[PDB]
Design an enzyme around this catalytic site. Structure first.
Site, mmCIF file in Angstrom:
data_model
loop_
_atom_site.group_PDB
_atom_site.id
_atom_site.type_symbol
_atom_site.label_atom_id
_atom_site.label_comp_id
_atom_site.label_asym_id
_atom_site.label_seq_id
_atom_site.Cartn_x
_atom_site.Cartn_y
_atom_site.Cartn_z
ATOM 1 N N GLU A 35 46.184 41.798 32.785
ATOM 2 C CA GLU A 35 45.391 42.069 33.982
ATOM 3 C C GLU A 35 45.157 43.567 34.154
ATOM 4 O OE1 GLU A 35 43.658 40.084 35.580
ATOM 5 O OE2 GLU A 35 44.555 38.098 35.482
ATOM 6 N N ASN A 46 34.126 42.336 40.256
ATOM 7 C CA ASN A 46 33.668 41.029 39.800
ATOM 8 C C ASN A 46 32.165 40.854 40.023
ATOM 9 O OD1 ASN A 46 36.344 40.181 39.119
ATOM 10 N ND2 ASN A 46 36.742 39.780 41.287
ATOM 11 N N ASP A 48 30.540 38.648 41.515
ATOM 12 C CA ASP A 48 30.174 38.165 42.841
ATOM 13 C C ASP A 48 30.299 39.242 43.911
ATOM 14 O OD1 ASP A 48 32.848 38.405 43.368
ATOM 15 O OD2 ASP A 48 33.224 36.270 43.666
ATOM 16 N N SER A 50 33.124 40.885 44.620
ATOM 17 C CA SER A 50 34.508 41.094 45.017
ATOM 18 C C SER A 50 35.135 42.084 44.032
ATOM 19 C CB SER A 50 35.293 39.779 45.067
ATOM 20 O OG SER A 50 35.422 39.193 43.775
ATOM 21 N N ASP A 52 39.032 43.258 42.071
ATOM 22 C CA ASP A 52 40.430 42.954 41.751
ATOM 23 C C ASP A 52 41.260 44.243 41.760
ATOM 24 O OD1 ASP A 52 39.552 40.318 41.334
ATOM 25 O OD2 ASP A 52 39.628 40.476 39.164
ATOM 26 N N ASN A 59 42.469 39.480 43.999
ATOM 27 C CA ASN A 59 41.031 39.481 44.245
ATOM 28 C C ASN A 59 40.701 39.568 45.736
ATOM 29 O OD1 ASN A 59 38.288 38.950 44.388
ATOM 30 N ND2 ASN A 59 38.324 37.310 42.857
HETATM 31 CL CL LIG Z 1 34.769 44.448 46.481
#
Ligand SMILES: [Cl-]
Ligand SMILES: [Cl-]
Ligand SMILES: [Cl-]
Ligand SMILES: [Cl-]
Ligand SMILES: [Cl-]
Ligand SMILES: [Cl-]
Ligand SMILES: [Cl-]
Ligand SMILES: [Cl-]
Ligand SMILES: [Cl-]
Ligand code: NA
Ligand code: NA
Ligand code: NA
Length: 129
Positions: A35, A46, A48, A50, A52, A59
């Site tokens: 990760e 990400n 979408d 978002s 991490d 997330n």
């Molecule tokens: Cl974000």
């Protein structure tokens, strides 16, 4: 902070992750490796929108507030920035909630794709624990 492999194993164990929800310490270190490469400051955006955050790339879609993820939740009730601290407490507490949510460590896609079913014990080999 970039943790050593055994250094992180020790921190995770201290914070109660070893065998938490049945996931041996090696599972957690493997997940962290892929990760974040053990870097508490890791972030990744990400598709979408978002983001991490941290050693376990938690997330903002569900788990922390960054104020820039429309329609998201903050189920660990923490600012996402708290997930980048050299102290792993916030990341560990939040991961405990995530791994408890029904799908275990499958919540971490990298764990499923790179750690699941593998000899994860190797990640803690030789560590003073
Ligand atoms: Cl974000
Ligand atoms: Cl760092
Ligand atoms: Cl390593
Ligand atoms: Cl293990
Ligand atoms: Cl970023
Ligand atoms: Cl994290
Ligand atoms: Cl938000
Ligand atoms: Cl919420
Ligand atoms: Cl499980
Ligand atoms: Na179990
Ligand atoms: Na970063
Ligand atoms: Na959020």
């Amino acid at each position: 902070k970039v943790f050593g492999r055994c250094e992180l194993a020790a921190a995770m164990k201290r914070h109660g992750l070893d065998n938490y929800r049945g996931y041996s310490l090696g599972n957690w270190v493997c997940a962290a490796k892929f990760e974040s490469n053990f870097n508490t400051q890791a972030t990744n955006r990400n598709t979408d929108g978002s983001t991490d955050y941290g050693i376990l790339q938690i997330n903002s879609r569900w788990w922390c507030n960054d104020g820039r993820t429309p329609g998201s939740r903050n189920l660990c009730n923490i600012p996402c920035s708290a997930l980048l601290s050299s102290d792993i407490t916030a990341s560990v507490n939040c991961a405990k909630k995530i791994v408890s949510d029904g799908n275990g460590m499958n919540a971490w896609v990298a764990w499923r794709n790179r750690c699941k079913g593998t000899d994860v014990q190797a990640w803690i080999r030789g560590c003073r624990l």
